[PDB]
Amino acid sequence: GPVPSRARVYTDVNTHRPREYWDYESHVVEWGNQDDYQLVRKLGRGKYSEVFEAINITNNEKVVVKILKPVKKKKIKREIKILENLRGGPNIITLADIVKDPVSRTPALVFEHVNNTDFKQLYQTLTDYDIRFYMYEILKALDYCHSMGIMHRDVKPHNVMIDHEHRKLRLIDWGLAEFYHPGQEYNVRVASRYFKGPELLVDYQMYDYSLDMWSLGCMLASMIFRKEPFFHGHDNYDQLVRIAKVLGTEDLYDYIDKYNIELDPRFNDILGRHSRKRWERFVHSENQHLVSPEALDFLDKLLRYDHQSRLTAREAMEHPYFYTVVKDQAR
Numbered sequence: 136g137p138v139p140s141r142a143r144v145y146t147d148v149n150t151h152r153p154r155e156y157w158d159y160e161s162h163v164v165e166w167g168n169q170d171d172y173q174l175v176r177k178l179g180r181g182k183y184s185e186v187f188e189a190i191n192i193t194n195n196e197k198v199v200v201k202i203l204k205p206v207k208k209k210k211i212k213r214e215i216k217i218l219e220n221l222r223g224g225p226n227i228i229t230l231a232d233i234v235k236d237p238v239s240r241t242p243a244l245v246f247e248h249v250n251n252t253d254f255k256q257l258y259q260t261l262t263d264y265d266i267r268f269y270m271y272e273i274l275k276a277l278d279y280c281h282s283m284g285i286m287h288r289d290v291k292p293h294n295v296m297i298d299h300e301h302r303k304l305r306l307i308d309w310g311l312a313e314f315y316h317p318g319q320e321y322n323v324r325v326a327s328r329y330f331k332g333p334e335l336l337v338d339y340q341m342y343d344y345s346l347d348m349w350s351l352g353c354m355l356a357s358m359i360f361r362k363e364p365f366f367h368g369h370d371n372y373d374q375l376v377r378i379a380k381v382l383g384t385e386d387l388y389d390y391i392d393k394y395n396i397e398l399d400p401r402f403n404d405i406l407g408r409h410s411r412k413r414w415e416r417f418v419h420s421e422n423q424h425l426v427s428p429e430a431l432d433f434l435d436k437l438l439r440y441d442h443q444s445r446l447t448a449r450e451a452m453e454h455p456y457f458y459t460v461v462k463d464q465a466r
């Protein structure tokens with residue numbers, strides 16, 4: 136059958152942790168008091184679901200309340216355990232409390248209050264240095280959660296909040312996150328279509344942290360090329376076709392043969408044969424001040440079919456694309 140795969144880095148982090156760190160089903164959720172918080176107003180209305188600004192009356196502090204949609208108890212405890220494990224990490228949203236409605240028993244997460252200038256307003260006015268800076272901030276969050284044995288599995292602009300005034304960034308929406316365990320098969324119905332890695336589109340279940348690095352590559356390509364989204368597929372099959380129309384089908388079939396991925400029969404005729412299009416083909420005039428040789432080389436090392444060939448978050452942070460960004464943050 137499929138050839139087994141292991142992550143290149145952070146492979147055994149959860150194995151060296153105590154069991155209670157990652158065994159979220161055995162964790163006992165200690166719910167707080169809902170009456171400690173009063174809702175003030177809706178936040179991100181139209182784009183975000185059940186996100187409220189609230190006041191913690193026990194200390195007169197502003198917080199954010201996220202009322203969760205009805206899902207299984209297993210997924211609730213998983214997200215809570217992951218948020219608590221990552222609390223305090225760089226650029227990770229901070230979980231403040233866990234409350235539940237008395238009568239309806241609806242779960243709700245309480246987060247720290249930060250500013251959010253959504254990408255829809257910044258996608259049109261991001262500088263070349265601003266792209267590098269915020270990419271690096273996302274990489275810090277990804278390296279941390281990967282080093283803590285966590286896959287985010289839903290990296291996309293909607294799940295990244297940017298405080299443009301304070302130059303701050305938070306990775307949010309950890310409802311699809313999971314713990315990485317060597318040899319475990321994972322669900323392929325994760326992330327959004329435009330940011331799904333090829334391992335999800337070919338139903339290879341033994342993926343790892345490198346899935347997040349593909350999604351990040353999709354975000355970078357949309358920013359420096361001014362094409363949102365960069366891989367604009369209309370269904371799951373078309374998503375892999377649009378990727379194949381850029382990376383070529385030669386490396387896709389080598390990827391399929393490397394891990395003995397039994398691709399479905401009709402899907403093989405869908406892909407057909409496509410040559411690899413060089414990254415300079417997507418550059419023109421308006422998106423020209425954002426494309427550099429180091430930007431294309433960095434993007435090329437993220438958008439690889441082979442999940443084991445993509446850069447890790449740490450290797451990405453040391454790419455020359457961030458050379459000046461690294462030295463400027465150190466001051």
Ligand SMILES: O=C(O)c1ccc(-c2oc3c(Cl)cc(Cl)cc3c(=O)c2O)cc1
Nearest residue numbers: 178179183199201246248249251307308
């Ligand atoms: O479930 C989650 O992972 C999650 C976590 C945090 C937030 C969150 O959203 C905000 C929005 Cl949409 C607008 C504004 Cl102006 C501020 C915030 C904010 O401070 C904040 O923490 C939303 C969802």
Ligand SMILES: [Cl-]
Nearest residue numbers: 182183184185
């Ligand atoms: Cl949402």
Ligand SMILES: [Cl-]
Nearest residue numbers: 291292293294
């Ligand atoms: Cl998005």
Ligand SMILES: [Cl-]
Nearest residue numbers: 313320321322
């Ligand atoms: Cl899973």
Ligand SMILES: [Cl-]
Nearest residue numbers: 365366367377
């Ligand atoms: Cl496309």
Ligand SMILES: [Cl-]
Nearest residue numbers: 281344447448
């Ligand atoms: Cl990594």
